[PDB]
């Protein structure tokens, strides 16, 4: 669509922790977020699914790498 207009609902459901921090949050942050935004699973499916987003590129799980969970293609 345009740059990244799909991270609107994501950054919102994830900014609760990295709102003004850096976008990249810890796994414990995702387990609580991915477990409620449009998604909703368990601290095991999320902590074991973060290996897909957060891995070492830069910050743990930022929005650019967080949308991969709510829509990993």
From Swiss-Prot:
Signal peptide: none annotated. The modification N6-methyllysine is found at residue 40. Ca(2+) 4 binds at residues 54, 56, 58, 60, 65. The modification N6,N6,N6-trimethyllysine is found at residue 40. The modification Phosphothreonine is found at residue 35. The modification Phosphoserine is found at residues 6, 26. The modification N6-acetyllysine is found at residue 19. Ca(2+) 3 binds at residues 18, 20, 22, 24, 29. It is found in: Cytoplasm; Cytoplasm, Cytoskeleton, Spindle; Cytoplasm, Cytoskeleton, Spindle pole. The modification Phosphotyrosine is found at residues 24, 63. Ubiquitination results in a strongly decreased activity. Phosphorylation results in a decreased activity. Residues 5-40, 41-73 form the EF-hand domain. The N-terminal and C-terminal lobes of CALM bind to the C-terminus of KCNQ1 in a clamp-like conformation. Binding of CALM C-terminus to KCNQ1 is calcium-independent but is essential for assembly of the structure. Binding of CALM N-terminus to KCNQ1 is calcium-dependent and regulates electrophysiological activity of the channel. The C-lobe interacts with KCNN4 channels in a calcium-independent manner, whereas the N-lobe interacts with the S4-S5 linker of KCNN4 in a calcium-dependent manner playing a role as calcium sensor and gating the channel. Homotetramer. Interacts with CEP97, CCP110, TTN/titin and SRY. Interacts with MYO5A and RRAD. Interacts with USP6; the interaction is calcium dependent. Interacts with CDK5RAP2. Interacts with SCN5A. Interacts with RYR1 and RYR2. Interacts with FCHO1. Interacts with MIP in a 1:2 stoichiometry; the interaction with the cytoplasmic domains from two MIP subunits promotes MIP water channel closure. Interacts with ORAI1; this may play a role in the regulation of ORAI1-mediated calcium transport. Interacts with SYT7. Interacts with MYO10 and MYO1C. Belongs to the calmodulin family. Calmodulin acts as part of a calcium signal transduction pathway by mediating the control of a large number of enzymes, ion channels, aquaporins and other proteins through calcium-binding. Calcium-binding is required for the activation of calmodulin. Among the enzymes to be stimulated by the calmodulin-calcium complex are a number of protein kinases, such as myosin light-chain kinases and calmodulin-dependent protein kinase type II (CaMK2), and phosphatases. This protein has four functional calcium-binding sites. This is Calmodulin. The lineage of its organism: Eukaryota, Metazoa, Chordata, Craniata, Vertebrata.
């Amino acid at each position: 669509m345009k740059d990244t207009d799909s991270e609107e609902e994501i950054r919102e459901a994830f900014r609760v922790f990295d709102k003004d921090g850096n976008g990249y949050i810890s796994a414990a942050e995702l387990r609580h977020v991915m477990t409620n935004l449009g998604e909703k699973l368990t601290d095991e499916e999320v902590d074991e699914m973060i290996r897909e987003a957060d891995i070492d590129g830069d910050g743990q799980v930022n929005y650019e790498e967080f949308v991969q969970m709510m829509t990993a293609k």
